[PDB]
Design a protein around this ligand. Structure first.
Ligand SMILES: Nc1ncnc2c1ncn2[C@@H]1O[C@H](CO)[C@@H](O)[C@H]1O
Lengths: 113, 382
């Protein structure tokens, strides 16, 4: 290939963003396990509604952290020759959007009336 | 514990506040704990804590009904004031009537709490005092606090009271256009009386002030402006342009997807800043809407065309202020730029052409000029 030293700078930025995404994804993973735990658990019904609505603050914080990541990714300008960077950027945005769709699922299952 | 520090200058702004200190023969504008030279005039109430500044603005999307901002639009006003009634239709937080006085109503640690506007502003002032102390490594008590020239007695008193509640010894309340003229040493220029036009264009407010400086005395001759015109309106025009472009290119309407619009708005605001020092800005947003990548660009000329009526309209309050001050544009000795939106080259060009090529006072960071002049005043009164 014609791999340039300049692309290494963009790839490093994207790696830092991937690490930041992984930290937020671990918070989402704990929300999913607790949500599954309440839905399939042995709590009485009135306590179940309360336990589910207690996840609201954390799910909203998780959504916001993912949105901030997308805004930081959106500051990148990658020339068409920087193919690896573009593929990495595309993969990272799709991964964040799939995580946001899981956050939306959590929101659909809590604080319902 | 800490040694006693110097007196500071605080620009207590509608959306952002700024603190400066005069040290080693110059003004240092103080960065907050996040490295920002301006601090959002935001206060948030959560199930567990009270957040001020950047930490409050950062969680506004997560807790909108308990995140207070714009307390300056309420401070010293009666509940039935036309401004209070008009503004409360747009705020996500509640404003209640307490015996004719407005109060912000919020949920705080699971309890319904109400606060007067001066209590909210006292919390922003407490943060500005702490920002100064974190930088200086000394306790800060003395401060000059600024207010708009059009603030009446009640609005001035309520600002002084916010300073008192914040534990500040308010050395003086001075007008924002006066502070900007002080920052440029306009009072120290030799000769007769000087007529000064202050052109203050922020993110959400436009204020024109005409001052006369005679023998070191500042007299406000007139005030004009547009209370809700600012940088945000220019961002709106750019967003509308790009939503229309996505419809033409992809036959898809992104406008009901809040996250796609927010991503686009954030990129627009950033591209607009780029356009003040470059003639073109590029935007690349992967998977903006229904998996479609949005790769585009905007020239400075296109940005100017999209906002032509708004930029041109900034001269109408200038003419109104001149009319009210009973002065001809040729009698203006100094023009001062305040507010981040004054960085727009077309705005500078229109104002300079109106004043027949006269140079503008713009070397001081327009977001910091008011705090700068306040810090100069604070040092003089020390
Ligand atoms: N370089 C700039 N060009 C144009 N507008 C700016 C610039 N810097 C700050 N602003 C705007 O000033 C306002 C107050 O921060 C915001 O609307 C912001 O976008």
């Amino acid at each position: 290939g014609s791999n340039s030293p300049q692309e290494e700078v963009e790839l490093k930025k994207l790696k830092h963003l991937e690490k930041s995404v992984e930290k937020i994804a671990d918070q989402l993973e704990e929300l999913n396990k607790e949500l599954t735990g309440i839905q399939q658990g042995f709590l009485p019904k009135d306590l179940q509604a309360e336990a589910l609505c207690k996840l609201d603050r954390r799910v909203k914080a998780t959504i916001e952290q993912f949105m901030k990541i997308l805004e930081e990714i959106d500051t990148l300008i990658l020339p068409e020759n920087f193919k690896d960077s573009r593929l990495k950027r595309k993969g990272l945005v799709k991964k964040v959007q799939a995580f946001l769709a899981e956050c939306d699922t959590v929101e659909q299952n809590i604080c319902q009336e | 514990s800490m040694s006693k520090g110097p007196a500071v200058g605080i620009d207590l702004g509608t959306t952002y506040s700024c603190v400066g200190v005069f040290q080693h023969g110059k003004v240092e504008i103080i960065a907050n704990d996040q490295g920002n030279r301006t601090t959002p005039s935001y206060v948030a109430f959560t199930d567990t804590e009270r957040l001020i500044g950047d930490a409050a603005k950062n969680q506004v999307a997560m807790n909108p009904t308990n995140t207070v901002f714009d307390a300056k639009r309420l401070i010293g006003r009666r509940f039935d004031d036309a401004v209070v009634q008009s503004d409360m239709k747009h705020w996500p937080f509640m404003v209640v009537n307490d015996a004719g006085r407005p109060k912000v109503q919020v949920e705080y640690k699971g309890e319904t709490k109400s606060f007067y506007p001066e209590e909210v502003s006292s919390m922003v002032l407490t943060k500005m005092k702490e920002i100064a102390e974190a930088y200086l490594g000394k306790t800060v008590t003395n401060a000059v606090v600024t207010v708009p020239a059009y603030f009446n007695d009640s609005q001035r008193q309520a600002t002084k009271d916010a300073g008192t509640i914040a534990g500040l010894n308010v050395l003086r309340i001075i007008n924002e256009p006066t502070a900007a003229a002080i920052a440029y040493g306009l009072d120290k220029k030799v000769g007769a009386e000087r007529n000064v036009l202050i052109f203050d264009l922020g993110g959400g407010t436009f204020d024109v002030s005409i001052l006369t400086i005679e023998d070191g005395i500042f007299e406000v001759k007139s005030t004009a402006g547009d209370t809700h015109l600012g940088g945000e309106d220019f961002d709106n025009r750019m967003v509308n342009h790009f939503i229309a472009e996505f419809k033409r290119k992809h036959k898809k309407d992104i406008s009901e997807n809040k996250r796609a619009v927010r991503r686009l708005r954030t990129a627009c605001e950033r591209a607009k800043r780029t356009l003040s020092s470059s003639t073109q800005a590029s935007i690349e947003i992967d998977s903006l809407y229904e998996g479609i990548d949005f790769y585009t660009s905007i020239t400075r000329a296109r940005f100017e065309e999209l906002n032509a009526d708004l930029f041109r309209g900034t001269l109408d309050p200038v003419e109104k202020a001149l009319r009210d001050a009973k002065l001809d544009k040729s009698q203006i000795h100094d023009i001062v730029l305040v507010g981040g939106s004054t960085r727009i080259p077309k705005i500078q060009k229109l104002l300079q052409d109106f004043f027949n090529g006269k140079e503008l006072n713009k070397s001081i960071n327009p977001d910091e000029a008011v705090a700068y002049g306040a810090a100069v005043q604070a040092a003089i009164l020390s």
